[PDB]
Amino acid sequence: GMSNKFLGTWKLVSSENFDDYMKALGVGLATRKLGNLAKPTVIISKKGDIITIRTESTFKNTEISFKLGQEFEETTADNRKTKSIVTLQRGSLNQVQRWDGKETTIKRKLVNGKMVAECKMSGVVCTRIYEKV
Ligand SMILES: CCCCCCCCCCCCCCCC(=O)O
Ligand SMILES: [Cl-]
């Protein structure tokens, strides 16, 4: 299933077009000002068939535990309450979030030993790169 190369503790090192992505989610300015300044660290772990993705930052922390391909309630860092699913496509980890008839996706794939996360919303595209510790 999911590559054990994902398991570990990743540190963000680059964000591209994050603001426009947050605006597309309806995030207020003042909140964005801190989001753009944030440098989260992501911890991915598994217990059996359950995967957990934790996000730690000075501003907000998050955590989702899920089985692949099974819908699950999620609370995003901007406090959206979504019905999310995580799929596996060509070794990429694709998280979708549905709420209020709106929809966003966060695709996570490994590239040359780095985790790359693409966030798409209303045509906007974010690209955040993480480095293993
Ligand atoms: C995780 C930092 C929180 C920033 C402040 C909340 C506003 C943004 C909420 C949605 C961001 C989702 C992007 C996740 C991308 C990643 O894997 O780093
Ligand atoms: Cl931080």
Curated annotation (Swiss-Prot):
Q: Which Gene3D superfamilies match?
A: 2.40.128.20
Q: Where does (9Z)-octadecenoate bind?
A: R108, R128, I129, Y130
Residues annotated to bind hexadecanoate: R108, R128, I129, Y130
N-acetylserine modifications at: S3
Biological process according to GO? fatty acid transport; membrane organization
**Keywords noted in UniProt:** Acetylation, Charcot-Marie-Tooth disease, Cytoplasm, Disease variant, Disulfide bond, Lipid-binding, Neurodegeneration, Neuropathy, Transport
* Pfam families, per the entry: Lipocalin
Q: Name one GO cellular component term.
A: nucleus
SUPFAM superfamilies recorded = Lipocalins (SSF50814)
Task: Supply the CDD domains for this chain.
Answer: FABP8
Disulfide bonds listed in the record: C119-C126
What InterPro entries does the database record attribute to this sequence? Answer: Calycin, Fatty_acid-bd, ILBP, Lipocln_cytosolic_FA-bd_dom, Myelin_P2
What is known about its subunit structure?
Monomer.
Linked pathology is: Charcot-Marie-Tooth disease, demyelinating, type 1G: An autosomal dominant demyelinating form of Charcot-Marie-Tooth disease, a disorder of the peripheral nervous system, characterized by progressive weakness and atrophy, initially of the peroneal muscles and later of the distal muscles of the arms. Charcot-Marie-Tooth disease is classified in two main groups on the basis of electrophysiologic properties and histopathology: primary peripheral demyelinating neuropathies (designated CMT1 when they are dominantly inherited) and primary peripheral axonal neuropathies (CMT2).
Q: To which protein family does this belong?
A: Belongs to the calycin superfamily. Fatty-acid binding protein (FABP) family.
Task: State the protein's purpose.
Answer: May play a role in lipid transport protein in Schwann cells. May bind cholesterol.
Further information: P2 protein and myelin basic protein together constitute a major fraction of peripheral nervous system myelin protein.
Query: Mind telling me what this protein is named?
Result: Myelin P2 protein
Gene symbol here is: PMP2
